[PDB]
């Protein structure tokens, strides 16, 4: 599985630019796609989404009326067209795949992105910012304004890990399920409006920033992020 | 419904669209069952027939129709447990060898079983009599007394052919079933048209039965 | 002099159920969901409307002679509905015959999707054409549909309407039926002791019932406006009830003598 | 010496018959006569899954009592969602002549087979987001009738060549062959402890096998025609059969003979499938007369009828938690009852 | 068919030497399992509509 994004550069305000992403290694037409951008010294932010089969398209309120998303299945390529660029659009853009059926794990693969330089919503709170910590147990908390538990018995909360210089990686989906390829020392539990992620027997390759994300309703929102040092 | 729930129903609808498209393509096909004894001419019944153990399936295209032929001779088991799979076929093709004096009374017995089966009450049969060139070059040496001891009549080739065909037709006891007979040799290369005419007459009778005239 | 009306009571009552049963069977039984049963359903709907909206109301206009003291806004509705539903019954017979003609002559192509498309077009056209003939006098004015004098309500007697309504409702479709069923007889014989007898018996019944139930009515309607013949009122009523009688033998031909239809009838 | 060995068979035959009579002092109906009847069981249709375009031949529940798999002659393999009536996967098949299917206990694999004399294994949870063929097992000389999973690496199959076999998926080779039947094997049931299993064939006999040693332990003969279905009791010490003579029978392992017979004078058609309930009190059977009957396993009385199909009922199934029953038929539909 | 005859005789001896119990005890053990699990069978005793997923 591979996802490579192209485009980027330096563009004057008011101009236009087009970004493209290539896929090779998986059934492209069966997956939905997202665009997520991260400011140079800030966190994550959802942008756009196009469904599998090109039937549902969603936009964020910030970029509505200026951005357009499209896909070309036979060539396995995803596009993003931008017009009337401001100085608040300078960020690094990511491509994320997601598939939706009973028992699936969405947001399970991210791709290295490109950098662009232009020169009634649920609030998710991460009170802590930095925690100093090998061979120890650490817990990270999260909070929401609205309850994330649905009448079908499902709680929608996602945990991500981003090591320095690397794309984010999925850790926990739903509320407690452990993603494939993740060591069994990660556990996730919580109740409505209160959630916790626990790590037992901390080791190397566990330093980074941890993010919250809710999938109850659009637009999708993230948390601030908690950093582990030393 | 949740956001992830609405994305699940869209996947289901796209699956149902693909199934519907596949059904339309498969509906415009003609399916036939190929039966007979060993070394009788089943494998080389149509010259332009391509192949695409268990069950052997061969197909060919004539005029503007697609034909599918199924040969089940490798199933050396009880037929009563899998014969109902081929219940919706258009017709049955039966091949017999006139030269083999020992294969008869086994071809006749197998003909009686299929022709009086419960799942084939109203299924027509196209009958093929193979190796007419060898039969006319053997009757002089063997006066048909080996296969049919209770046979009295001329030793001519034409009379022998009429006697063999009448024996196969005697096993039919039904008012909504017909048998089409045709004699062919090894060098003959006109058999796709014979099947085309037989199938054409079968559908006409079926449509007449629905109206109620026949 | 009164038991005759009792006989007509059974005719109007039974016809409403022989067809209601057919409509219920088609929807209830999942086996009757193929292509050729759509045309059978259309014939039943037209027969029902004659059963409950034409004959029962026209039965009142028999003891009262030629007097209609029931409303000037009601003759226009009753006359229009009488013409509309009767013409639908004639063209649904033609639609069934044309479907059988093309399944025998052209069996390789007239099947699967292309058969359904032509079948549905005929159902659409059989009602569009019927409405044009019925509503034309009431929306232009080719003649008087009603008059306060003597309280008489009756269809237009203008010579232009007589020569156009009768041809487009009976004479044009009659020729199609005769041509189709003659070729079907030729097809049965040329392709082919019981079959010969069954070919003549069934085809004769279909033609004779259709021929006898309508021609006596439609010959008079084409002569009286042109000539000056004044048919006695007794014959004007005998020739009319024969036409209504056809909606009764319709299920006695296209559904009664079918093996697949008998099984569903026994279950209910 | 042939005559002496032929006669020695008859000597050993009467010894087994006489020993069984010595251990039969009372009947099940006589003992269970002082029990209150079950009553009347009425079940309604809750779901109707549609999408198949031909006859349905087999189905199998999952362990979670939520997902299904069904097989049809149109060359399709569909996985359903009972709760929401949704489709999760649709698997094309190389051969359209399929007669059996199964669902792995872990929920990672499915299997199918038929007139191609091959058992195929499919991978559901894998990358690339599609179902792929993982392994094809060959070696049988007749059509496959049934198959069941032991774990992710072992499978047991029965064929129309009068044999049963145990396979290793990774190596793709047989490890044990079970011989002794004289007719085509049609059914196969697996014990809860996965240490024994039973089979029914066309010679009107049933046999009990040991997986580890690959030998036959007991044989049961009570029917007058071929056996089409078989299933264990929930305890694991009894099983039930269904034949073409319009009769179900209950056999016991420890006593090693027949206990009860389920028959009615107005049933002539054969039996396609059988199943039990969670407590083992109700026995469900499918018939060729468009109907499914519910029996009382102890009093041998008829308790209810399920009637919703327009063609032959060909497959049955009861969930692990015993909350619903699903039936499939030849009219390209399947329903869930509760 | 000497080999076939000698194969069937040995199998018959294996089946003819086992331990069997009375049918009366066998039927009693089936009563106990049904009586001990009757309260956890939805098909026997229907569950209330609030606990029925279908
Ligand atoms: N009783 C049926 C009346 C009717 C149906 N179609 C018609 C067409 C023409 C005329 C007419 N010109 O009187 C009458 C009718």
SS (H, E, C) chain A: CEEEEECCEEECCCCEEEEEEEEECCCHHHCEEEEEEECCCCCEEEEEEECCCCCCEEECCCCCCCEEEEEECCCCEEEEEEECCCHHHCEEEEEEEECCCCCCCCCCEEEEEEEEEECCCCCEECCCCEEECCCCCEEEEEEECCCCECCCCCECCEEEEECCCCCCEEEEECCCEECCCCCCCEEEEEECCEEEEEECCCCCCCCCEEEEEECCCCCCEECCCEEEEC
Angle, CA of A56, B17 and D108, to the nearest 5° = 85
Helix, strand, coil shares, percent, chain D, to 5: 10, 50, 45
Residues A150 and A105 in one domain: no
Residue D54 CB partners (closer than 8 Å, separation 6+): D72, D73, D74, D332
**DSSP code of residue D290:** S
From the list D86, D127, D130, which residue is nearest A1 (CB)? Answer: D127
User: Closest Cα partner for E17 from D35, D227, A99, D218?
Assistant: D218
Chain B within 8 Å of C133 (Cβ-Cβ)? no
Phi first, then psi: what are they for B180, rounded to 5°?
-105, 125
Q: Is the distance from CB of D284 to CB of D294 less than 8 angstroms? A: yes
Chain A within 8 Å of D18 (Cβ-Cβ)? no
Dihedral sign from CA coordinates of C182, C187, C188, C189 = positive
A100/chain B closest Cα distance in angstroms? 6
3-state secondary structure (DSSP) of residue C152: strand
Which residue reads 């693969």 in tokens? A109
Domain harbouring A130, CATH code: 2.60.40.10
**Beta-sheet pairing, D109-114 with A186-191:** unpaired
Give the orientation angle of helix C172-191 with respect to helix C194-220, to 10 degrees.
Answer: 170
Which residue reads 């089936």 in tokens? E30
3-state secondary structure (DSSP) of residue D283: strand
Dist. CA D158–CA D141, nearest whole Å: 11
For a substitution probing ligand 1, which of C169, C220, C222, C243 has the most ligand atoms within 8 Å of its CB? C169
Two tokens, residue C156: 């237009």
CB-based contact A216 B2, cutoff 8 Å: yes
For a substitution probing ligand 1, which of C54, C55, C86 has the most ligand atoms within 8 Å of its CB? C86
Residue E19 CB partners (closer than 8 Å, separation 6+): none
Q: Distance of CA A202 to CAs A131, A134, A226, C92, D206, Å? A: 13, 5, 16, 83, 58
Q: Is the distance from CB of B93 to CB of B49 less than 8 angstroms? A: no
Which residue reads 């004007």 in tokens? C236
Closest ligand 1 atom to Cα of C162: 12
Q: Is C84 in the pocket of ligand 1 (CB under 6 A)?
A: no
Dihedral sign from CA coordinates of B35, B71, D331, D305 = positive
Q: Is the distance from CB of C159 to CB of C223 less than 8 angstroms? A: no
Residues A79 and A128 in one domain: no
Which chain E residues have a beta carbon less than 8 Å from that of D336? 54
Q: Is C86 in the pocket of ligand 1 (CB under 6 A)?
A: yes
Dist. CA D254–CA E25, nearest whole Å: 10
From the list A55, A101, A218, which residue is nearest B8 (CB)? Answer: A101
Q: Is C122 in the pocket of ligand 1 (CB under 6 A)?
A: no
Dist. CA B38–CA B110, nearest whole Å: 12
Residues A62 and A160 in one domain: no
Task: Report resolution in angstroms.
Answer: 2.7
Q: Is C82 in the pocket of ligand 1 (CB under 6 A)?
A: yes
Residue D147 CB partners (closer than 8 Å, separation 6+): D100, D102, D111, D113, D119, D155, D156, D157, D158, D188
Domain B3-211: CATH superfamily is: P-loop containing nucleotide triphosphate hydrolases (3.40.50.300)
Site from B180, B197, B198, B211 to mutate, C interface, most C CB atoms within 10 angstroms: B211
From the list B9, B18, B81, which residue is nearest D184 (CB)? Answer: B81
Angle, CA of C250, C251 and C253, to the nearest 5° = 75
Dist. CA B159–CA B157, nearest whole Å: 6
CB-based contact D235 E33, cutoff 8 Å: yes
Q: Distance of CA B179 to CAs B93, B125, B176, Å? A: 10, 5, 11
Which chain D residues have a beta carbon less than 8 Å from that of E15? 16, 216-219
Q: Distance of CA B173 to CAs B87, B179, C192, D236, Å? A: 19, 12, 19, 51
List C residues 21-40 in contact with B (Cβ-Cβ < 8 A).
Answer: 36
Strand partners, D165: D157, D177
**Beta-sheet pairing, C146-147 with C152-153:** antiparallel
Q: What is the largest CA-CA distance in chain C?
A: 64
Binding residue per annotation — C82? yes
Q: Distance of CA D73 to CAs B80, D52, D53, D112, Å? A: 18, 9, 8, 12
Q: Looking at chain C, after which residues does the C atom sit over 2.5 Å from the next written N, breaking the chain?
A: 192
Q: How far is CA C90 from the centre of its chain?
A: 4
**Beta-sheet pairing, D76-81 with D86-92:** antiparallel
**DSSP code of residue D222:** -
Domain hosting A167: range is 124-228
From the list B19, B78, B81, which residue is nearest D90 (CB)? Answer: B19
3-state secondary structure (DSSP) of residue D231: strand
Chain A within 8 Å of D85 (Cβ-Cβ)? no
Domain boundary among A118, A148, A174: A118
Peptide linkage before B152 cis (omega within 30 of 0):
no
Strand partners, B125: B92, B179
Size of interface B-D (CB pairs under 8 A): 59
Q: Is the distance from CB of D196 to CB of D208 less than 8 angstroms? A: yes
Q: Is the distance from CB of A197 to CB of A16 less than 8 angstroms? A: no
Q: Is the distance from CB of A26 to CB of A95 less than 8 angstroms? A: no
Dist. CA B87–CA B120, nearest whole Å: 7
| Number of domains comprising chain E | 1
Chain C partners (3+ C-beta pairs within 8 A): B
Which chain B residues have a beta carbon less than 8 Å from that of C258? 212
Q: Is C166 in the pocket of ligand 1 (CB under 6 A)?
A: yes
Chain A partners (3+ C-beta pairs within 8 A): B, D
**Beta-sheet pairing, D132-137 with D119-123:** antiparallel
Chain D within 8 Å of E43 (Cβ-Cβ)? yes
Closest ligand 1 atom to Cα of C169: 8
Give Rg (Cα) of chain D: 20
Q: Is C243 in the pocket of ligand 1 (CB under 6 A)?
A: yes
Dihedral sign from CA coordinates of B180, B186, B190, B195 = positive
Q: Distance of CA A132 to CAs A68, A164, A168, C124, C216, Å? A: 42, 16, 21, 79, 107
Q: Is C87 in the pocket of ligand 1 (CB under 6 A)?
A: yes
Q: Is C155 in the pocket of ligand 1 (CB under 6 A)?
A: yes
Q: Where are the beta strands (DSSP E) in C117-186?
A: 146-147, 152-153
For a substitution probing ligand 1, which of C78, C138, C221, C239 has the most ligand atoms within 8 Å of its CB? C221
Domain hosting E44: range is 1-54
Dist. CA D293–CA D290, nearest whole Å: 10
Dist. CA B80–CA B95, nearest whole Å: 21
User: Closest Cα partner for C121 from C141, C100, C95?
Assistant: C95
Site from A32, A99, A102, A105 to mutate, D interface, most D CB atoms within 10 angstroms: A102
Residue A51 CB partners (closer than 8 Å, separation 6+): A32, A57, B7, B10
CA dihedral D244, D245, D248, D254 (to 10 degrees): -100
Domains in chain D with CATH codes: 1-337 (2.130.10.10)
HSE-CB of B168 using CA atoms within 13 angstroms: 26
Buried b (16+ CB within 10 A) or exposed e, C149-173: eebebebbebeebbeebbeebbeeb
Buried b (16+ CB within 10 A) or exposed e, D215-247: ebebbbebbeebbbbbbbbbeebbbbbbbbbbb
Dist. CA D150–CA D102, nearest whole Å: 11
From the list D74, D84, D117, which residue is nearest B54 (CB)? Answer: D117
Strand partners, D335: D48, D327
3-state secondary structure (DSSP) of residue D121: strand
**Beta-sheet pairing, D98-103 with D109-114:** antiparallel
3-state secondary structure (DSSP) of residue B121: coil
Dist. CA C240–CA C88, nearest whole Å: 17
């Amino acid at each position: 599985v591979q996802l490579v994004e192209s485009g980027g550069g330096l563009v004057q305000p008011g101009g236009s630019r087009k970004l493209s992403c290539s896929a090779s290694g998986f059934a492209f037409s069966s997956f939905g796609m997202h665009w997520v951008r991260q400011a140079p010294e800030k966190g994550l932010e959802w942008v756009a989404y196009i469904s599998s089969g090109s039937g549902t398209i969603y936009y964020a309120d910030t970029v509505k009326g200026r951005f357009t998303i499209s896909r070309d299945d036979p060539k396995n390529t995803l596009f993003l067209q931008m017009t009337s660029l401001r100085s608040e659009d300078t960020a690094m853009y990511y491509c994320v795949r997601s598939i939706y059926y009973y028992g699936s794990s969405p947001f399970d693969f991210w791709g290295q992105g490109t950098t662009l330089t232009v020169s009634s919503d649920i609030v998710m709170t991460q009170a802590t910012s930095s925690v100093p910590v090998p061979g120890e147990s650490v817990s990270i908390s999260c909070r929401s304004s609205k309850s994330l538990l649905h009448s079908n018995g499902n709680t929608y909360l996602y945990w991500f890990l981003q090591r320095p210089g690397q794309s984010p990686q999925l850790l926990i989906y739903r509320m407690s399920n452990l993603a494939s390829g993740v060591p069994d020392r990660f556990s996730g539990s919580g109740s409505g409006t209160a959630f916790t992620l626990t790590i037992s027997r901390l080791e190397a390759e566990d330093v980074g920033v941890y993010y919250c994300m809710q999938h109850l309703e659009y637009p999708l929102t993230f948390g601030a992020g908690t950093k582990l040092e030393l | 419904l949740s956001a992830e729930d609405k994305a699940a129903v869209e996947r289901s609808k796209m699956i149902e669209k693909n199934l519907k498209e596949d059904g339309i393509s498969a509906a415009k096909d003609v399916k036939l069952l190929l039966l007979g004894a060993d070394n009788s001419g089943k494998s080389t019944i149509v010259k332009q027939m391509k192949i695409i153990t268990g069950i052997v399936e061969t197909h060919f295209t004539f005029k503007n129709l697609h034909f599918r032929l199924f040969d089940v001779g490798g199933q050396r088991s009880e037929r009563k447990k899998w014969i109902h799979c081929f219940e919706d076929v258009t017709a049955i093709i039966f091949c017999v060898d006139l030269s083999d004096y020992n294969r008869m009374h086994e071809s006749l017995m197998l003909f009686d079983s299929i022709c009086n089966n419960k799942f084939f009450i109203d299924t027509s049969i196209i009958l093929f009599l193979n190796k007419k060139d060898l039969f006319g070059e053997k009757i002089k040496k063997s006066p048909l007394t080996i296969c049919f001891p209770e046979y009295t009549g001329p030793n001519t080739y034409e009379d022998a052919a009429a006697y063999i065909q009448a024996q196969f037709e005697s096993k039919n006891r039904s008012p909504n079933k017909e048998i089409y007979c045709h004699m062919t040799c090894a060098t003959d290369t006109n058999n796709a048209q014979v099947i085309f005419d037989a199938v054409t007459d079968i559908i006409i009778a079926n449509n007449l039965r629905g109206c109620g005239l026949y | 002099g009164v038991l005759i009306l009792t006989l007509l009571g059974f005719l109007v009552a039974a016809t409403f159920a022989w067809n209601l049963l057919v409509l219920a069977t088609i929807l209830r039984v999942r086996t009757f969901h193929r292509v050729p049963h759509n045309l059978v359903a259309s014939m039943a709907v037209s027969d029902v409307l004659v059963a409950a909206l034409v004959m029962p109301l026209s039965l009142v206009h028999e003891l009262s002679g030629r007097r209609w003291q029931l409303g000037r806004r009601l003759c226009q509705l009753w006359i229009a509905c009488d013409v509309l539903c009767c013409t639908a019954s004639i063209w649904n017979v033609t639609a069934i015959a044309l479907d059988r003609y093309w399944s025998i002559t052209r069996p390789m192509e007239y099947t699967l999707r292309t058969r359904k498309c032509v079948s549905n077009v005929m159902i659409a056209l059989t009602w569009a054409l019927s409405a044009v003939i019925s509503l034309a006098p009431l929306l232009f004015g080719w003649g008087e549909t009603y008059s306060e004098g003597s309280e008489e309500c009756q269809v237009s007697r203008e010579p232009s309407y007589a020569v156009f309504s009768t041809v487009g409702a009976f004479y044009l479709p009659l020729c199609v039926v005769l041509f189709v069923y003659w070729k079907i007889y030729k097809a049965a014989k040329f392709r082919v002791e019981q079959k010969e007898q069954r070919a003549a018996l069934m085809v004769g019944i279909l033609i004779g019932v259709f021929v006898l139930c309508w021609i006596p009515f439609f010959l008079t309607e084409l002569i009286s406006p042109l000539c000056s013949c004044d048919i006695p009122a007794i014959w004007k009523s005998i020739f009319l009830w024969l036409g209504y009688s056809n909606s009764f033998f319709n299920p006695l031909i296209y559904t009664a003598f079918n093996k697949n239809y008998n099984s569903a009838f026994k279950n209910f | 010496e042939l005559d002496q060995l032929r006669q020695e068979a008859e000597q050993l035959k009467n010894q087994i018959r006489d020993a069984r009579k010595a251990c039969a002092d009372a009947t099940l109906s006589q003992i269970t006569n002082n029990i209150d009847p079950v009553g009347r069981i009425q079940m309604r249709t809750r779901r109707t899954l549609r999408g198949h375009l031909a006859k349905i031949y087999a189905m199998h529940w999952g362990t979670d009592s939520r997902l299904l798999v069904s097989a049809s002659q149109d060359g399709k393999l569909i996985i359903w969602d009972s709760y929401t009536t949704n489709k999760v996967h649709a698997i094309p098949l190389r051969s359209s002549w399929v007669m059996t299917c199964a669902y792995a206990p872990s929920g990672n694999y499915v299997a199918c087979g038929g007139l191609d004399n091959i058992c195929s294994i499919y991978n559901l949870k894998t990358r690339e987001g599609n179902v792929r063929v993982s392994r094809e097992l060959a070696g049988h000389t007749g059509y496959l009738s049934c198959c069941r999973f032991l774990d992710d690496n072992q499978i047991v199959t029965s064929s129309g060549d009068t044999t049963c076999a145990l396979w290793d998926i990774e190596t793709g080779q047989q490890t044990t062959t079970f011989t002794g039947h004289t007719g085509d094997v049609m059914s196969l049931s697996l014990a809860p402890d996965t240490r024994l299993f039973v089979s029914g064939a066309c010679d009107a006999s049933a046999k009990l096998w040991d997986v580890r040693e690959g030998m036959c332990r007991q044989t049961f003969t009570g029917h007058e025609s071929d056996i089409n279905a078989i299933c264990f009791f929930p305890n694991g010490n009894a099983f039930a059969t269904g034949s073409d003579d319009a009769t179900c029978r209950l056999f016991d392992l420890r006593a090693d003979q027949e206990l009860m017979t389920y028959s009615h004078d107005n049933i002539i058609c054969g039996i396609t499938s059988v199943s039990f309930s969670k407590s083992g009190r109700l026995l469900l059977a499918g018939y060729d007369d468009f109907n499914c009957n519910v029996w009382d396993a102890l009093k041998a009385d008829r308790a209810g009828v399920l009637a919703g199909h327009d063609n032959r009922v060909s497959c049955l199934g009861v969930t692990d938690d015993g909350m619903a029953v699903a039936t499939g038929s030849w009219d390209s539909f399947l329903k869930i009852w509760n | 068919s000497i080999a076939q005859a000698r194969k069937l005789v040995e199998q018959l001896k294996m089946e003819a030497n086992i331990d069997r119990i009375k049918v009366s005890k066998a039927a009693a053990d089936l009563m106990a399992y049904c009586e001990a699990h009757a309260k956890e069978d939805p098909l026997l005793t229907p569950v209330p509509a609030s606990e029925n997923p279908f």
